[PDB]
Design a protein around this ligand. Structure first.
Ligand code: A1AQX
Ligand code: A1AQX
Ligand code: A1AQX
Ligand SMILES: *[C@@H]1O[C@H](CO)[C@@H](O[C@@H]2O[C@H](CO)[C@@H](O)[C@H](O)[C@H]2NC(C)=O)[C@H](O)[C@H]1NC(C)=O
Ligand SMILES: *[C@@H]1O[C@H](CO)[C@@H](O[C@@H]2O[C@H](CO)[C@@H](O)[C@H](O)[C@H]2NC(C)=O)[C@H](O)[C@H]1NC(C)=O
Ligand SMILES: *[C@@H]1O[C@H](CO)[C@@H](O[C@@H]2O[C@H](CO)[C@@H](O)[C@H](O)[C@H]2NC(C)=O)[C@H](O)[C@H]1NC(C)=O
Ligand code: NAG
Ligand code: NAG
Ligand code: NAG
Lengths: 309, 309, 309
């Protein structure tokens, strides 16, 4: 009975190794998904509350949006020549800056004036590096993410709005309610291992990943999404700043421009999926390989038992 | 001759099962694609026709754009305190709204006035829910979609602009001309199983999918794209509304803001591909599995015939 | 010794064929990536230098941005009826244009006036096709691309900012330094097999592909990205033009609009990945198939040697 027991044990182990790793259930990874993101929540920046229309830069609500948390405004920028207001651009001789100095505000002319050598262009350049406050109440904003995915190979359409496992006081917590699509901005920042104060002050590119890992052999309700968070702006000047320009020409001839530098927390929504469904061909391939492996194991077992090595 | 005929039949069935499901022809699903969308067509909204530059929100023509169909304008919004114009925010006592009421227009102060308790912020809030007309002529807009895909594993570059199977009066109909890239907006809405009037009045997020399913073992001209349409904004307040803010500061000191609420039909272009090419390794694997399966079938056939069970 | 030598040679060839094509090392192609693009560099267009805030259309720095190189401005567009300024719309009789003529500037009315029959809408239409100069200094712009990828199946996070194989004078050249993420716009245009003058004058949609092809069986530092460039706006009127509209209502009642037509070079960043990691199941499958193929080869070899055919 030793040979039968040993071959049964070998076959059982081979089956465990195969079906545990899903040798069958051909896998599809080309998930086609659509994301609709909507921000809700109000906050104050200077002396005035700002609704959703203000801070979020892309109003459509695409896969990628920006939550603006700090604004630096430079108004009435006129064309001309003038020195730069930054420290690092010190000029002691007229030959210091030429076709070797990286421009910071405009095209250089090869001169030197007192405030720094003359960049040409928008004269009142950004006086940056100040103690401007941040939209602290943005720590309490909420993001509603409606994600609709469709695995094409198996024709499997699904969405994250699962009605079983209200939407007015629920948040997203991976422990209590890991299924509500409403993500608190403070919660997203905290779950990424980041302090919110520094992230809002300097800016960063967070990322929300919706892993659609499902086993289609089970029921339709079993396919559930998993939310994860990360930061994708780590080097090893870190930050995320971007500028809008609004132009106007007053009737007295001069051409003006106001420049708004925004430090925000850009959110990226990345959808990844991996769905495995049972298919005849991989099942046959795996069964044949398992049979041959069991045969090889049986051929080796008697030899190793007889030789005790 | 019975055994030879039976083994030939078993081998033929195994070959049918294998080659029908493409046991060989290793498959690649990581399709790298680029989409350029351009809208053409004019329509009237208030008392004036609007060209392409007006209704479409992203002027670049990215993978996702919005066809604005309804506009609600609130001009000269000033900062301050005032009640809200919506019905649902009824206030009979000063304690009704506090740290339990969801803000609708601004940060609450805990008071109660006649128009509703005081939200702080942009005072002339949106008087919404009106009978504003819709851009009905947007039913006749056309969308030109240039899609260029490149399967990287096989180095296979292709595009949907097939010159064989003019581009001035052709539309997209899956029956007559299922190859023209020009998609009528009314046609897209109709093919999604949606009435255009309600969709334009309330807004929605349609989706155009370009399935690049091809068999590279055939000629280059055989690889063709298939267009499909769906809606990806179905819960089970449905809609798709987004707001622009334009700011101006008149010389008499006050800070103003005009808010434009747009109800549009956002179009998402999703590209999915699955290309299978013959490879030596999967062919050998499939042949070995087929040989072993045929052997197993022959081993079972004589037994089942002799035992008649 | 002939049979042993022949079977060893057959086994060696089978192993070469299998391990060379990676029969083992299950492959994942669903790469989840995030791209942050930042443009640096100044240029002059009319009589004034323009910094980053001006030419690039999406200020956020998404996966797709546009480098504007030519601007055509039409100011003070008023609603009304007037003929069109283009040549192709010749009208000799009042019945020439009707429900058969493609509108170019507005909704037609079925009349004929001297400048061309009356389109309704923004009256001072674009007088296009001029000799407007181009932002030639945009040939010296630089693009910083920070790409962070994460293969989910193997949980493999990586980025293109490799610190071993400064970032102030380095460019991207596939021969000298093929690893610096700083891409010169002129270099990108040249590597796509395109002249920069015509591309800037008419517009085009270039594409930068970051192939993340790695072998995870080696060390972590071995996984490196490969940059490639292409053009995805080739038919077989080519170009890429898009228009912004800025509205204002002067106090004397009339409603105005200024239209800015931009000819740019839109850059698309496409991330593709294919990562193979050793797994037990594919290894067993490949070993079984190799054993069976070697057996078949041995069965055929003696026959072909004895029969000499
Ligand atoms: C006459 N009024 C103005 O000039 C003016 C008014 C403003 F409310 C603001 C302002 N500050 C902040 C601060 C935060 C955290 C969020 C939004 N903020 C805003 C509003 C908009 C202004 N944006 C714009 O594109 O405007 C062209 C870009 C996005 O932010 C400004 F920067 C300028
Ligand atoms: C002095 N003139 C204005 O204030 C004004 C003029 C306008 F034509 C309009 C207006 N209505 C509609 C209706 C449809 C269906 C499409 C486009 N529409 C527009 C034009 C733009 C105005 N957009 C903007 O970003 O403007 C900052 C956002 C997109 O729509 C407006 F909302 C305000
Ligand atoms: C009172 N001043 C103006 O009206 C005015 C001022 C300007 F600098 C310009 C202008 N020309 C060029 C040429 C290049 C190559 C790049 C940027 N350029 C610009 C600036 C902006 C204006 N953009 C805008 O959205 O403005 C609403 C869209 C993007 O280009 C303009 F088109 C109009
Ligand atoms: C974000 O919201 C939380 C939850 O309401 C705020 O925390 C509470 O704030 C109230 C304000 O009246 C205090 O009475 C509570 O004691 C706070 N609770 C806790 C646990 O701190 C929080 O202050 C808000 N954040 C910001 C920046 O305003
Ligand atoms: C969209 O275009 C269609 C096709 O031209 C319009 O339908 C025709 O409209 C003309 C207008 O002169 C009528 O004479 C025809 O009888 C209509 N034909 C049909 C089959 O209805 C349609 O009206 C346009 N839609 C909108 C909203 O203007
Ligand atoms: C882009 O930059 C290059 C590199 O600096 C410029 O080419 C040089 O331009 C300087 C200008 O003083 C000349 O002295 C050099 O002789 C040029 N070198 C070469 C090899 O041509 C180039 O002119 C710049 N392009 C534009 C359009 O301004
Ligand atoms: C126009 O007026 C502004 C202030 O409104 C002033 O700074 C500027 O010098 C004037 N420009 C001209 C050309 O008169
Ligand atoms: C400025 O003028 C506007 C109308 O143009 C008026 O409503 C407002 O009260 C005035 N504000 C101040 C601060 O004088
Ligand atoms: C308003 O003034 C503009 C010039 O500023 C002029 O062209 C236009 O005819 C005037 N419109 C009205 C309605 O008075």
């Amino acid at each position: 009975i030793n040979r039968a027991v040993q071959l049964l044990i070998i076959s059982y182990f081979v089956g465990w190794v195969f079906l545990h790793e899903k040798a069958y259930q051909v896998r599809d990874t080309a998930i086609e998904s659509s994301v609709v993101t909507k921000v809700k929540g109000f906050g104050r920046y200077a002396n005035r509350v700002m609704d959703v229309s203000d801070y979020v830069t892309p109003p459509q609500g695409t896969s990628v949006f920006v939550i603006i948390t700090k604004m630096i405004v430079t108004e009435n920028q006129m064309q001309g020549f003038c020195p730069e207001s930054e420290e690092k651009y010190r000029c002691v001789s007229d030959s210091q800056c030429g076709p070797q100095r990286f421009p910071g505000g405009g095209i250089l002319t090869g001169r030197c004036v007192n405030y720094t050598c003359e960049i040409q262009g928008w004269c009142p350049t950004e006086v940056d590096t100040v103690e401007m406050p941040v939209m602290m109440e943005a720590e309490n904003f909420t993001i509603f993410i409606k994600n609709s995915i469709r695995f094409p190979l198996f024709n499997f359409e699904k969405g994250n709005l699962l009605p079983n496992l209200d939407m007015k006081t629920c948040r997203f917590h991976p422990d209590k309610a890991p299924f509500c699509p409403i993500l608190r901005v403070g919660d997203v920042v905290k779950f990424a291992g980041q302090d919110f104060a520094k992230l809002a002050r300097t800016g960063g590119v967070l990322g929300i990943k919706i892993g659609w890992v499902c086993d289609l052999d089970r029921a339709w309700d079993q396919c559930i999404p998993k939310y994860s968070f990360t930061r994708l702006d780590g080097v090893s000047s870190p930050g995320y700043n971007f500028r809008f320009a609004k132009y106007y020409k007053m009737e007295n001839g001069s051409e003006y421009r106001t420049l708004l530098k925004a430090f925000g927390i850009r959110f990226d929504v990345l959808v990844y999926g991996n769905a495995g469904k049972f298919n005849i061909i991989p099942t046959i391939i795996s069964s044949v390989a398992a049979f041959t492996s069991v045969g090889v194991g049986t051929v080796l077992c008697d030899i190793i038992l007889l030789n005790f090595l």
